[PDB]
């Protein structure tokens, strides 16, 4: 279970920490939130190997882009992710949510699902291994939300996913992308379970 939400100051990325082989939890403290640039981050779902390989290549492309043309847009990062996912769709299983902060564009969220298509959304949630939910409590999400609300909205949403699902579990990790900088948040089961 992964999601990214755009709010007033920037964007927040959220996920669980569970990696599975069959029914065995290989890693119960996985970091599914990955840095491709200072203020461009992604959520990884699907194959752990495939998502890591793609994220490592995208990070290389944005590092090289920054050297020649300066800081790249979130749209640019999404395009690089899509190019790798679309052209290699036959051999790949990666569901990626790209969240980034620009001073011009503020918080942007792009989803690259299994197809290799790109979609720009106000927020995105993927559950049960790359299953993107349309609706998902559209009345629960408003535009220009506060950071306090955004963390509460993602915390609740991921909590409900972990509760019903066995693929998701462990701690809830969040990354807050704003003009101020990068903040890392962690919520342990005892906090988020009683929701």
């Amino acid at each position: 279970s992964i999601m990214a939400v755009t709010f007033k100051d920037g964007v927040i990325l959220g996920a669980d920490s569970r990696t599975t082989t069959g029914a065995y939890i290989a890693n119960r403290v996985t970091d599914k939130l990955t840095r491709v640039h200072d203020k461009i981050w992604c959520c990884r779902s699907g194959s752990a190997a495939d998502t890591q390989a793609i994220a490592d290549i995208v990070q290389y492309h944005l590092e090289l882009y920054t050297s020649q043309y300066g800081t790249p847009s979130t749209e640019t990062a999404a395009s690089v992710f899509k190019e790798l996912c679309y052209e290699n769709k036959d051999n790949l299983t990666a569901g990626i949510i790209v969240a980034g902060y620009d001073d011009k564009n503020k918080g942007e969220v792009y989803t690259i699902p299994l197809g290799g298509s790109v979609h720009k959304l106000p927020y995105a949630i993927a559950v049960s291994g790359s299953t993107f939910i349309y609706g998902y409590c559209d009345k629960n999400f408003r535009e220009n939300m506060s950071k306090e609300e955004t963390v509460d909205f993602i915390k609740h949403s991921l909590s409900q996913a972990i509760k019903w699902d066995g693929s998701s579990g462990g701690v809830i990790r969040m990354v807050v992308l704003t003009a101020a900088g990068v903040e890392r948040l962690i919520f342990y089961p005892d906090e988020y379970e009683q929701l």
Binding site: A15, T20, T21
Partner: peptide
């Protein structure tokens, strides 16, 4: 198997 939310 392979590792896989």
């Amino acid at each position: 198997x392979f590792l896989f939310x």
